[PDB]
């Protein structure tokens, strides 16, 4: 929830401020081992501290008005008109959604009973891969 996001952002960037001044006291840099409990947390995410491009993003001012005004330049409608992945971080996490979804549909093998997987006679599903648009024409994506 947004109220949870803002109180955890407040308290987690407070923890970052105290950790940063005690790491400037110890003359070092804030590593990944401190700020690992703060990880997917904060409205600018704490993730954004550990980006390579972060110093460059310290000169990207007015980026939120820019992402709002992208709707008058880009015909593709942006659902994340309000945020950017670079500056705010990824403000959601659906990895456990995917895990709990696989578990809710019956597990991996409870899913794969609805498929032609056992007709392929693959002994296990672990070493497998798809071929995204390979087909029978050896792809050919590029043709006239």
């Amino acid at each position: 929830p947004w109220e949870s996001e803002f109180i955890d952002s407040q308290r987690v960037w407070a923890e970052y401020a105290l950790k940063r001044q005690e790491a400037i006291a110890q003359n070092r840099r804030l590593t990944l081992e401190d700020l690992e409990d703060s990880w997917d947390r904060g409205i600018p995410r704490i993730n954004t501290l550990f980006q390579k491009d972060r110093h460059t993003l310290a000169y990207d001012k007015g980026w939120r008005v820019r992402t709002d005004f992208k709707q008058y330049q880009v015909l593709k409608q942006n659902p994340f008109w309000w945020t950017h992945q670079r500056h705010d971080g990824k403000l959601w996490n659906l990895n456990n959604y995917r895990t709990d979804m696989i578990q809710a549909l019956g597990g991996v093998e409870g899913i794969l009973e609805h498929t032609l997987f056992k007709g392929t006679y693959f002994p296990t599903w672990e070493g497998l891969f798809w071929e995204k648009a390979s087909g029978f024409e050896e792809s050919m994506k590029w043709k006239k």
């Binding site: 995917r98 809710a104 899913i111």
Partner: peptide, 9 residues
């Protein structure tokens, strides 16, 4: 068929 992730088909 809808809710299975794309990796799992």
């Amino acid at each position: 068929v809808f809710y299975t992730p794309k990796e799992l088909g």
